Structure formats: C-alpha cells, structure tokens
Design a protein around this ligand. Structure first.
Ligand SMILES: [Cl-]
Ligand SMILES: [Cl-]
Ligand SMILES: [Cl-]
Ligand SMILES: [Cl-]
Ligand SMILES: [Cl-]
Ligand SMILES: [Cl-]
Lengths: 174, 174, 174, 174, 174, 174
C-alpha cells in the first residue's frame, strides 16, 4: 500500500480523522458564536472578535492534523459536520461557559489520542500532540477560566453594565 | 432644451430635488443634535462629535445628488428647509432613537427613488444610488442599532452612569 | 437656570440665534450659486468654486456663532431656513452683484449685533465679533468689489469673451 | 458547446459584438478628428490632444467589451469598420457638436444593451455596463456640454480669437 | 422585532442562509481536494495550493454573506454541512472538471438569489451580489475553463508527463 | 494650396494614405488574433500577449505615417477598414504562418513606397521609411521565422504538448 507509512496504526489514522471532525465542528461553533455577538441586538464587538479568533485557531488545528495525516501516510477522510449545539448563545457568560465545555471536550479527545499513541508506541504522534496541541489547549482553558471569573464578578445587580464593561475593558476591539 | 440630457425623466429630476431637501433637512437635524450635546448642562463630547460627523455625511449626500442632477442635465431647485423636529433632544438614547427613525426615512426615500428609476429604465440613476447611498445607509443603520443595544444595556438602575460610560468608552472624544 | 451664564443678555442670545439663521441662509444661497455655475449650459468652473468656498465660509461663521452661544450659556434655537432669492443667477456680473448685496446685509447684521453688545456692556461678544467676523467681512467685500470692477471692465462689446477670460485668468480652477 | 458559458444569451452575445464595432468606429472617428486638428492649416494642439485621448478611451471600451465576451464564453466576431462620417471637421465648435452626437449614439447603444440584459435576466452584463460604461459616458457628455457652452460664449464677433483662446486656456497642451 | 430591518424579506433571509451552507460546502470540498493533492502518492503541489486558495475564497464568500445578513437585520442560521461528494478526486483533469461543476452550481445559486432580490425589489441585495460575487464567479469559471483546455491539450499519449508539466509550468508552487 | 508642402508628390501622399489603411488592417487582424488566443477553449496567454503587442505596434506605425503626412502638408484620408481574413485562427503554427504572410505584405508595401519616393526624388520620405519602418519589419520577420522553426520542431507526434511548451517557455506570460 503506502510507500512512506511506518509505525502508523490504523487505530491512530482513524482517531486523527475523528479529531479533525471535532476541530472543524468547534471551528463552526465559534463562527456561529462570533456572528451571534455581531447581531445588532447583541452588539458586543470584543466578544465577536474573541470567538472569530477561536474559529480560526480551531480550523488551524484541523489543518495541522490533516497535514500530519498525509506526512504519516494515512488517508484524510472527511465526514459530515454537524451544526453547532445552539442557534442563539445567550449572554457573554453563557457563551464563555459553552466555550470552556467545548475546549475541555477537545482537550479530552487530545488526551485520549495521546494515550492511544502511547499504547501503539507511536512517539511521533505523541510528540506532535505535545508540541502543537496540549499546551495550546491548557493555555486557552486558563484564559477562558480567567475570563469566566471576571465576567462573574461583574454580574452584581447590574448585569448589562457588567457585560458592557467586560467587553470594553478586557476584550480586544476597534 | 438640454444639450446633454438623455434618458433622464422629469419624474426622477423632481424626486432628486426632493431627496436633496430631505438630506439637507437631515444635516440640519444633526447640526441641532450636535449643539445640544455641546451644551454645558448636557456635556457629552463623544455624542456631540457623532452627530456633527453625521451632519457632514448628510450634507455630502446632498452635494453628490446635486452634482449628479447637473451631470444628467436636470435643474437643481432648492426649497425652504424646515427646522428640526425638536429644540431639545433628551438623553443619548432619545437622540439615537430619533436618529435611527430619521435614517430609516432617508433609506425609504432612497428605495422609492430606486424603484422610480427602475420603472423609468434609468440604469445610471439606479447604479448611482446603489454605489453611493444604499450600502452607506445600511451600514449606518446597523451602527446605530449596535449603539442603541449598548445604550439600552447600560441604563440599568443607574442611567447617568450608563450614559457617561457609553460616551467615554464607545464614542470618539479628545 | 444656567450654571455658567454671566453678563449674557437675553437680547444678545436671541440676536445670535437670528444671525445664525442669516449665515445659514447665506451659505444656502452660495450652494445654489455654485450649482448654477456647474450647469452644462453655464459652465464657469472658477465661478462655481468661488461660490462653493463662500458657502463653506458662511457655514463656518454659523458654526462659530453656535459654539459661542453654548460657551456663554445661551440656548441655540434653529428656525426654518428660507430658500435663496433666485433659482437662476444670470451672468457672473449678476451673481457677484447679488453676492455683494448679501455680504453687506451680513455686515450690517454684524454691526447691529456689535452695537447691541456695546449697549449691554458685553465685551466678550464685541471682541468675538471683532476677532472672527468684522475684518473677515471687510476683506471679503473688498475682494468682491475688486472682482466687480474687473468683470465690468471686461464686458466691452464682447460679454461672452469677457466672462470667459475673467473665469480663466482671475478665478481658481483645475 | 462552451464549457464556461452560463446565463449568456445569443442576443446579448450578438449585441456585444455590434457594440464593439460602434466603439471601434468611434475610436476611428476620434483618430480622424485628432489628425484634422494637427494639420498645419488648422493647428489647434489642445483640440488635437482632446480627440486623440478620446480615440484611446473608445478603443479601451472596445477592448473591455471583447475581454468580457470571452469571460462569458461568447465568440468575438469582428466586422468591417466604416470610415468616419467626414474627412474635414470644420471649427472646434463643429467638431465638438459632432463628438456629442457620437457620444449620445454610444450612450443610447449602452442603454439598449442594458435593457436587453435586464430582459434576459443577465445581471453580470447589467453590472458590467453600470460599472465600466454608463457613468463614464454621463461624465464625458457633461464635459462636452461644458466645452460646447464655453466655445459658444467665445464666438462673439471674433470667432478666430475665441477659438484660439478656448484651445489655449481650457484644453491641455505643451 | 428588528430595530434595523428594512425592505429585507423572509424569502431573501432564508435564501442567504441556504447560500452560506452552499459556500461552506464548497469550501469543505476544496479543503478535501487540497489534501488529496498533498498525498505522497499524488504529490502535485501547485494543484494542492490552487484548491486550498479556493477553500479560503469560498469561506470568505460565506463570511461576507453572514456579515450582510446581520447588516440587514436577518438571523444567521447554520445547518449541518454535508461532506464532499468524493473521498478521492482522480487526476488533475477529474478534479478541475469537478471544480467547474461546483462553481457553476454556486453561480446558478447566486443568479437565483439575484432574481429573488429583483422580484422582492431589494436593490441592496442585488448590488451586494453584483459587487462581491457575480464577477468574481465569472472570472473564476473563465480561469478554470482556461486550465481545463491546457490540461486537455497536455494529455496526448503521455498523461503523467502532461499532468506534471501543467502543475510545474501553469500552477503556483515553491 | 499648402503653405508648407515642398517636394511632396500627390503619388506619395496617396500611397501614404493607402499604407495607413494596410497598417490599421494589420492592427485589427492582430486584435482578432489576440482575442482568439484569449478564448477559454484556446487559452494560450503568451500567444494572446504576442499578438496584442503586434496590434499596438501596427497602430503605432499607422500613427507615425499620419503624423508624417501632416508634417509634409499632405491630407490624411481614412477609408473603410476591412475585417480580418479569418474569424478563427487555428493553432499557434497556423496563426504565426498567417502573421508572417501579413508582415511580408506590409514589408512589400514599404519597399514599393520607398521605390516611389526614390523615383520622385523624395529623400525625406525614403529616410523616414528607412529610419522607422524597414529595419523594424526585418527584425520582426526574423523573430517570426525563429518562432515558426521552434513551433515546427515541437509538433512531433504530440502537437498539444508542443503548443503548450512553446507558449510557456518561449512566449512572455504572467
Ligand atoms: Cl446536529
Ligand atoms: Cl417645520
Ligand atoms: Cl423664501
Ligand atoms: Cl461609410
Ligand atoms: Cl452527504
Ligand atoms: Cl473583407
């Protein structure tokens, strides 16, 4: 079959294709989050830009997985992409809670693939995830946790005021 | 009569002169809004500057219509300009609600003139409006809608605080 | 009432609002003059540009009066703006004669307001007019008088030739 | 037949080829006008340069139509090009009157093609004409009308003097 | 309901959401085409880069439609995204034939939406498509047709040689 | 009659007008060749650009002849321009064979005019042709002969391959 494939299990090849679908799903979810915060009746520019940056970051992760699939001699297989879980995303707090749930699901999928690679004695796969995915995910989840705490402290008795101030003074706008 | 006029109906010529009056009326309304927010007992610099920019934008639209009237060989005719609807404009929220009502009236006048041009098979007129007016109006109304939503979220129990913060952190001052 | 108003009579406040209307009327008159000289059957670019510059200058005078009204703690009040006295403005000579009549009417209104300020012992008002209006008006009327004399000397037996040459060789075009 | 053609009627394809012939005819007419004003017994450099620029502008319009024909998958077909209507073009006034007649004939051909495209529900064709032809034609006809008025005012009793002055002081020489 | 929506039908709003799904489907198809040509057993870098550029171009079209949806006050609604029609894309000729079929399907969807906008007297929608989509699509389909002709002429008796040469000497690499 | 004409025969004047028609015919032929190679079903960019450059070169020759006609005091007379000999131009080899036939016809017309000028003892005419036409024509015909030989050597058993390679590796594109 493949002229280059070496030490690359069918189990890892399949799991990489599944992980691509999870990252593209996440990218699509962040595209929906971004456009919700762009609505004229939501209108939180910094929140919109935060989620569009994450849509691009998740697409880049999918792209890197697909490049690696070909580098190892596996076959990229694309499946249908389910639409995001919601059409409307509530407050910035609701959205950032949904985002951290989504990132922890990606992080668990990364850890599960690392464990499969470990079991299959596939050190290139394990290094690839460690070098391009695990720390990026830990750093993003820490950032989201920091944002959740600041959003929560700003709710008070004046939720609209707090949501405005967080978008203006923490998030980047423009 | 005219050495240059071609495919330019008397109906469109008249409607263009009426639209100039509507844009000059709008410009005058925004000059009044700007000077109200400059009062020492109102004193919202970013709101003042927002409305002065719109006074200049509406004057530029009138100027472009008048230039086009002459380019087509119609006769610019000026009528009396009514004063604005109010002498005092209330809160930033009141003013931005009046502004969006005014812009939707200009937008409907643009759409009505486009429909007349369509009926008269006047593609230069229809292109002129599409290229210099329709999208500028859609973008401005979207901006005003974004501002209305942010102003509304800041009212809370503390209207003065919200009105200050919106002027400081969204509007341009510096 | 006003937290800042000091030595600012109701008579001056009202007269300033009237003077704003006169300057905006003058600006509108110069916008009409400019577009008449832009017609394809008139086509005197330097004359068109001369009058558009004066439309902007008169608007700036209105703007400065309105800023001063607020600086003194008076209330800017806008009234309807009458359309210009003519729809068609004849020759460059006819137009420049109408312009000098209009400027002498503005100059008399300035002198009348200065005399009211003098009577009311309002030195800020009298200084404001002296510093931003009286000499600008004297200089403009002198310029118009210079232009009238040159236009008149060029009529001769060959009015079209003279009107072309004045526009080409005295007025600014591109 | 064509691998790219989509929504492109045979009626529009044929009309585009006819319009190319009209623009090339116009270009040839302006080449003849330019060389007439270059004669040592006519010798009006600014008039010569005005018409050579229009010869190049009309050729560019033909070129853009031909490029569009291929972009849509139609077949460019060239026909014989008739010589211009005159061998000698009289005065600058005669020439500019012939030019405005020629431009209004091109403008009507543009409007007729736009109406055909409209009837055929061909929005690419209608946009192409609006974006590259209709406003360029309106602006050129306005310019020619401005020039006709200035040429006419300079005839007076001294036609040679006026024709010299217009060439020297309005037209570009280098 | 919407504070900004004006002249924006539910029919157009729905059709825009469907068109977004078609553009995202097309983007996903081009991502699959790109990674197929990146395989070590296909290895045509210029073909890979051609299709990745188109994946980004189709995503940008989806993004612009979604921005416009919000500008008009409609609600962006995302649906499931079907996977591409093939897992393996054959030769460069097979792939470029599939690409032109896909682009003509997008072009027909654009023309159908333009016709709906026309019927609904929605000139902003019709201008938006003309200005950002119709000519981009005509130009891309012309490019693909040019490439199909060059690929076809290179097949000869030596298909591998021709496929190499086209990738090396026409497409951008590295 | 002419104030400048000296040593300029009616025979040369007429022959110059005929030669202008031949150069404009040649320019039109090259415009048709260029647009044929721009077709999506021909698609040879370097061949398209080669022939468009020659269309411009032939127009420049016509322009120089017309300038010279006026410099000598002859009268430029334009005649109808026949359409090119073909609507479709076959292969690059067919087109380059037609081009060399066309250039040798122009070269013979140049040599015939030089011989007339010689017979009429018109050294300015003979120098003009030698300095701006004869060597340009010899150099172009040599270039076309070089191209014909390279095109012919590339036909082999694989005409499509050869036609691609010649366009890619000899002609200017991208
Ligand atoms: Cl789902
Ligand atoms: Cl009123
Ligand atoms: Cl009145
Ligand atoms: Cl004829
Ligand atoms: Cl499917
Ligand atoms: Cl023929």
């Amino acid at each position: 079959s493949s002229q280059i494939r070496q030490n690359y299990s069918t189990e890892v090849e399949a799991a990489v294709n599944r992980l691509v679908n999870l990252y593209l799903r996440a990218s699509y979810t962040y595209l929906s989050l971004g456009f919700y915060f762009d609505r004229d009746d939501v209108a939180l520019e910094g929140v919109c830009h935060f989620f569009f940056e994450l849509a691009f970051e998740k697409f880049e992760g999918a792209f890197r997985l697909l490049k690696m699939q070909n580098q190892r001699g596996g076959r990229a297989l694309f499946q249908d992409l389910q639409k995001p879980s919601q059409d409307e995303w509530g407050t910035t707090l609701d959205a950032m809670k949904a985002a951290i749930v989504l990132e922890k699901s990606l992080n668990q999928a990364l850890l599960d693939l690392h464990a499969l690679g470990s079991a299959q004695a596939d050190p290139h796969l394990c290094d690839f995830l460690e070098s391009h995915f695990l720390d990026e995910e830990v750093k993003l989840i820490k950032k989201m946790g920091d944002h959740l705490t600041n959003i929560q402290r700003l709710v008070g008795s004046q939720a609209g005021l707090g949501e405005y101030l967080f978008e203006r003074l923490t998030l980047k706008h423009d």
